[PDB]
Amino acid sequence: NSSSIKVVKLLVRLSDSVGYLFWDSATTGYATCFVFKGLFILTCRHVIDSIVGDGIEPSKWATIIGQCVRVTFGYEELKDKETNYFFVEPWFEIHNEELDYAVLKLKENGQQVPMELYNGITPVPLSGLIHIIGHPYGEKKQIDACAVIPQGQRAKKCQERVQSMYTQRSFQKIVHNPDVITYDTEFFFGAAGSPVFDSKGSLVAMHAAGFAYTYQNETRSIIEFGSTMESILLDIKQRHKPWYEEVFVN
Amino acid sequence: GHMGKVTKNSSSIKVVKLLVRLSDSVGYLFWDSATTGYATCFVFKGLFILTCRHVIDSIVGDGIEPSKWATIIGQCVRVTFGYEELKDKETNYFFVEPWFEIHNEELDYAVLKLKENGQQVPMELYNGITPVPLSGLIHIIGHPYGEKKQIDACAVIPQGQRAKKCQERVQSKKAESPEYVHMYTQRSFQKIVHNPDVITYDTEFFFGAAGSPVFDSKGSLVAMHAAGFAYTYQNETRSIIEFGSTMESILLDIKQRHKPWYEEVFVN
């Protein structure tokens, strides 16, 4: 579970591109995001669901996002929670519900936009150590070193953890899913959109959600998963090819 | 790990940035004497660095006259602060002055002095006296197994549980098979069971990390990692519990036994 000083020195520099996204309009909430490419940031899709609310026509979604969403990258202490924030352009076009990702665009306000975290496609580790950087529980920015659950063991672990709410009939969407990476982390609450890097510090996935339960007045989670950057970028290449060529190759 | 009773392993970005700043003051100490070996040290105060006493025992050797120890140290010990990759293992190193006067066997600490050879002396890690945490999370920075510099976030074992937890692991692994064995004396384990001068924790730096600085959850130097209680099972070597001498005890011992040097170094 220990890491080398070199990798952690890389990770703390990368953490400046991990942001806290918050909104306070008709709905109130938070999430984690990160600078994907250029002025574009990446987060989860159910985050946008929380931002807009139920029963709203899609034609209005962008207008809502550009009116109430703020993103700050310097949230390391309580005082910095809702200060020095970028606005978001009223634009919402690149997303997918299955892979659970959403692309937003920051609005330049004369500040320094953090370095992009997408350096290229990095293969997903089948085992070993990973590092998740985000804002769990809406708290200050934190980093966690986590153990990866190999896909072939996903069906086992779950059934153990239930026998040691839900059923094994409910994990059917992640047990044999090669587009997600499973792991045991403490960032299982409100850390949607937190980047997940491999043991060398390369962006490999984005944390999605978990499965919460209560035990001795404390909220725990059975298993956590995230959408792999390979899957997200391939879906973007296929569904939004003009935007992909406009942003990524030039 | 969220299946049993677990302490939070994660840290905040602010504390981790502080710790990567402090790691530049953690040094890999290697020696080529009658025996060849390695350990960890850290810049204590000014040019002085702190490591473990049994490290000096391993450097000098058995039976050597004490009057020679210093002269051996300042001739064979080298310390590098940039061992973050394999290529930097024994590059850009300081020598140590032929000086060995401040040490203690019971608390297992030893003070050495770097020799300014043109290299950059790191920042000292001793700012003030920090109370020892009774529980929670700590961070160890060092060179375990002689590898590149690493940092581990570990769970503190409260003092009152030292007698409990340990046995719970012993009887857990010992009941299985008759090939289990401890590699430590019980007389050596009973010296930390009710000892407030050491802090105990569960870490992965139970090898070659002697002298590694141990910081609290906020990033303040609180202890120096000493040793562990190793046990082998199925030909794999684990450790029941690890411990470190608190900086409180070390500084008190320095004030009591070496008052002139303490006033010469710390107050003036």
Residue numbers in the entry:
A (entry chain A): 340 to 503, 514 to 599
B (entry chain D): 332 to 599
Extract from the study:
Overall, the individual SPD chains are similar to each other, with root mean square derivations (RMSDs) ranging from 0.15 Å to 0.3 Å over Cα atoms. Thus, we focused our analysis on chain D, which is the most complete, but our analysis is broadly applicable to all chains. This suggests that the FAM111A SPD active site architecture is tailored to cleave smaller substrates, such as linker regions or disordered substrates, and not globular proteins. FAM111A possesses an oxyanion hole formed by the backbone amide nitrogen of Ser541 and Gly539, as well as a P1 residue binding pocket (designated as the S1 pocket) similar to that of chymotrypsin.
FAM111A (FAM111 trypsin-like peptidase A) is a serine protease involved in multiple cellular processes including antiviral defense and DNA replication. The FAM111A SPD belongs to the S1 family of serine peptidases, which includes chymotrypsin, in the MEROPS database. Here, we show that FAM111A is a dimerization-dependent protease containing a narrow, recessed active site that cleaves substrates with a chymotrypsin-like specificity.
